[PDB]
Design an enzyme around this catalytic site. Structure first.
Site, PDB file in Angstrom:
ATOM      1  N   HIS A  70       0.858  -1.211   0.000  1.00 31.44           N
ATOM      2  CA  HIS A  70       0.000   0.000   0.000  1.00 31.44           C
ATOM      3  C   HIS A  70       0.878   1.239   0.000  1.00 31.44           C
ATOM      4  O   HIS A  70       0.535   2.209  -0.690  1.00 31.44           O
ATOM      5  CB  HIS A  70      -0.947   0.010   1.225  1.00 31.44           C
ATOM      6  CG  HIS A  70      -1.747  -1.251   1.333  1.00 31.44           C
ATOM      7  ND1 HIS A  70      -2.703  -1.564   0.405  1.00 31.44           N
ATOM      8  CD2 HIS A  70      -1.759  -2.227   2.253  1.00 31.44           C
ATOM      9  CE1 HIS A  70      -3.289  -2.702   0.757  1.00 31.44           C
ATOM     10  NE2 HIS A  70      -2.701  -3.148   1.828  1.00 31.44           N
ATOM     11  N   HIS A 128       1.710   9.105   1.773  1.00 32.60           N
ATOM     12  CA  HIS A 128       0.715   8.970   0.723  1.00 32.60           C
ATOM     13  C   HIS A 128       1.103   9.955  -0.365  1.00 32.60           C
ATOM     14  O   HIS A 128       1.514  11.087  -0.061  1.00 32.60           O
ATOM     15  CB  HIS A 128      -0.735   9.284   1.234  1.00 32.60           C
ATOM     16  CG  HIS A 128      -1.093   8.531   2.458  1.00 32.60           C
ATOM     17  ND1 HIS A 128      -1.883   7.405   2.410  1.00 32.60           N
ATOM     18  CD2 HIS A 128      -0.705   8.657   3.735  1.00 32.60           C
ATOM     19  CE1 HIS A 128      -2.059   6.915   3.659  1.00 32.60           C
ATOM     20  NE2 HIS A 128      -1.292   7.630   4.469  1.00 32.60           N
ATOM     21  N   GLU A 149      -3.757  13.437   1.731  1.00 31.26           N
ATOM     22  CA  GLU A 149      -5.055  12.929   2.238  1.00 31.26           C
ATOM     23  C   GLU A 149      -5.838  14.097   2.837  1.00 31.26           C
ATOM     24  O   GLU A 149      -6.944  14.399   2.408  1.00 31.26           O
ATOM     25  CB  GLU A 149      -4.793  11.812   3.257  1.00 31.26           C
ATOM     26  CG  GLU A 149      -4.132  10.623   2.597  1.00 31.26           C
ATOM     27  CD  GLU A 149      -4.379   9.355   3.335  1.00 31.26           C
ATOM     28  OE1 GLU A 149      -4.122   9.266   4.555  1.00 31.26           O
ATOM     29  OE2 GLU A 149      -4.898   8.406   2.662  1.00 31.26           O
ATOM     30  N   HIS A 198       2.937  10.734   7.449  1.00 28.06           N
ATOM     31  CA  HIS A 198       2.259  10.407   8.684  1.00 28.06           C
ATOM     32  C   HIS A 198       3.230   9.733   9.633  1.00 28.06           C
ATOM     33  O   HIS A 198       3.750   8.631   9.329  1.00 28.06           O
ATOM     34  CB  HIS A 198       1.113   9.429   8.376  1.00 28.06           C
ATOM     35  CG  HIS A 198       0.022  10.138   7.658  1.00 28.06           C
ATOM     36  ND1 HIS A 198      -0.977   9.498   6.947  1.00 28.06           N
ATOM     37  CD2 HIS A 198      -0.268  11.448   7.599  1.00 28.06           C
ATOM     38  CE1 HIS A 198      -1.843  10.374   6.446  1.00 28.06           C
ATOM     39  NE2 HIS A 198      -1.419  11.585   6.832  1.00 28.06           N
ATOM     40  N   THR A 204      -6.635   6.084   8.106  1.00 24.66           N
ATOM     41  CA  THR A 204      -7.091   6.389   6.765  1.00 24.66           C
ATOM     42  C   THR A 204      -7.040   5.171   5.834  1.00 24.66           C
ATOM     43  O   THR A 204      -7.366   5.323   4.647  1.00 24.66           O
ATOM     44  CB  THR A 204      -6.318   7.556   6.132  1.00 24.66           C
ATOM     45  OG1 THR A 204      -5.002   7.102   5.819  1.00 24.66           O
ATOM     46  CG2 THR A 204      -6.331   8.802   6.996  1.00 24.66           C
ATOM     47  N   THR A 205      -6.617   4.021   6.334  1.00 20.54           N
ATOM     48  CA  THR A 205      -6.769   2.771   5.567  1.00 20.54           C
ATOM     49  C   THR A 205      -7.535   1.791   6.433  1.00 20.54           C
ATOM     50  O   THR A 205      -7.543   1.890   7.643  1.00 20.54           O
ATOM     51  CB  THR A 205      -5.426   2.102   5.270  1.00 20.54           C
ATOM     52  OG1 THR A 205      -4.734   1.733   6.479  1.00 20.54           O
ATOM     53  CG2 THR A 205      -4.530   2.962   4.407  1.00 20.54           C
TER      54      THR A 205
HETATM   55  C1  LIG Z   1      -1.257   0.830  10.897  1.00 22.03           C
HETATM   56  C2  LIG Z   1      -1.589   2.216  10.349  1.00 22.03           C
HETATM   57  C3  LIG Z   1      -1.702   2.434   8.954  1.00 22.03           C
HETATM   58  C4  LIG Z   1      -2.020   3.704   8.433  1.00 22.03           C
HETATM   59  C5  LIG Z   1      -2.101   3.817   6.927  1.00 22.03           C
HETATM   60  C6  LIG Z   1      -2.252   4.776   9.342  1.00 22.03           C
HETATM   61  S1  LIG Z   1      -2.699   6.450   8.908  1.00 22.03           S
HETATM   62  N1  LIG Z   1      -2.703   6.637   7.325  1.00 22.03           N
HETATM   63  O1  LIG Z   1      -1.620   7.273   9.491  1.00 22.03           O
HETATM   64  O2  LIG Z   1      -4.053   6.697   9.441  1.00 22.03           O
HETATM   65  C7  LIG Z   1      -2.172   4.498  10.731  1.00 22.03           C
HETATM   66  C8  LIG Z   1      -2.421   5.532  11.770  1.00 22.03           C
HETATM   67  C9  LIG Z   1      -1.836   3.250  11.198  1.00 22.03           C
HETATM   68 ZN   LIG Z   2      -1.170   7.492   6.501  1.00 20.94          ZN
END
Ligand SMILES: Cc1cc(C)c(S(N)(=O)=O)c(C)c1
Ligand SMILES: [Zn+2]
Ligand SMILES: OCCN1CCNCC1
Length: 258
Positions: free
Chosen positions: A62, A94, A104, A117, A196-197
């Site tokens: 991803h 991303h 995002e 992130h 966000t995933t």
């Molecule tokens: C495991 C994991 C994967 C992802 C894409 C995120 S995110 N995109 O920062 O919300 C988080 C917090 C935690």
């Molecule tokens: Zn992220």
């Protein structure tokens, strides 16, 4: 037929496996800068990355994750809107197929080229897997990337990517300092949201920095050479791995500034 970003398994499909996709505190969101409330009670963000121990970098199919040893109180985020102490576990990005998209979160509908992130978990819950089950389990520091001058502190990441081109590849990645990815200013917006995933859990305090970092065209072109596919599968470039803005649903975004 697992989730992804592609033509038939991307964000608009995720709700079928993960009904919380249509929940009350989903991320990302558009940050309406005019309606964000200045909160004089917010504290400066404390980012203590002096002792951070990176371990490895992983193409998870991803994005890529730069992973940290989080078994001791090293690299921590606190202050800001947070109660308590959150420990860095990994960062990732991303990004888009073109410089005009990739972030995002958006700012007054502006898309940045990419978004970093830095994911942290609340030490009161003992590790990451338990923290994601809690409404204040995670704090994610989000930083926008625009294309312009290179970010020298990013180059060590860029240069290892060719060793993790395809899904499930990893490489040793020690002694990387995430302080080199931070902008000058720690002014931020903050709101309660989600991963966000998938699994899209509603466990995140989002802290989005106002000031973007600049990366070069050549740095982001190297992100776009990664692959969503595994080795020995037809090439699907890893691009456009962003979820679009989700409904705010009367949540208030607070500003640390102005
Ligand atoms: C495991 C994991 C994967 C992802 C894409 C995120 S995110 N995109 O920062 O919300 C988080 C917090 C935690
Ligand atoms: Zn992220
Ligand atoms: O010079 C680095 C280019 N690489 C090649 C393949 N994976 C992504 C980045």
């Amino acid at each position: 037929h697992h989730w992804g970003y592609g033509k038939h398994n991307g964000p608009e499909h995720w709700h079928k496996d993960f009904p919380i996709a249509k929940g009350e505190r989903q991320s990302p969101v558009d940050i309406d800068t005019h309606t964000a409330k200045y909160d004089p009670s917010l504290k400066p963000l404390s980012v203590s990355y002096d002792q951070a121990t990176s371990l490895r970098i992983l193409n998870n199919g991803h994005a890529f994750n730069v992973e940290f040893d989080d078994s001791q109180d090293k690299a921590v985020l606190k202050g800001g809107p947070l109660d308590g102490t959150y420990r860095l576990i990994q960062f990732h990005f991303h990004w888009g197929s073109l410089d005009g998209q990739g972030s995002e979160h958006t700012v007054d509908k502006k898309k940045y080229a990419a978004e970093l992130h830095l994911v942290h978990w609340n030490t009161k819950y003992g590790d990451f897997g338990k923290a994601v089950q809690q409404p204040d389990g995670l704090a994610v520091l989000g930083i926008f990337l625009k294309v312009g001058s290179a970010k020298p502190g990013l180059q060590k990441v860029v240069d290892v990517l060719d060793s993790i081109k395809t899904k499930g590849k990893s490489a040793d990645f020690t002694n990387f300092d995430p302080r080199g990815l931070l902008p000058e200013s720690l002014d931020y917006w903050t709101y309660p949201g989600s991963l966000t995933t998938p699994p899209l859990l509603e466990c995140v305090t989002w802290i989005v920095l106002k000031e973007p970092i600049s990366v070069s065209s050549e740095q982001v072109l190297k992100f776009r050479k990664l692959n969503f596919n595994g080795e020995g599968e037809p090439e699907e470039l890893m691009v456009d791995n962003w979820r679009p803005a989700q409904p705010l649903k009367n949540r208030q975004i607070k500003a640390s500034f102005k």
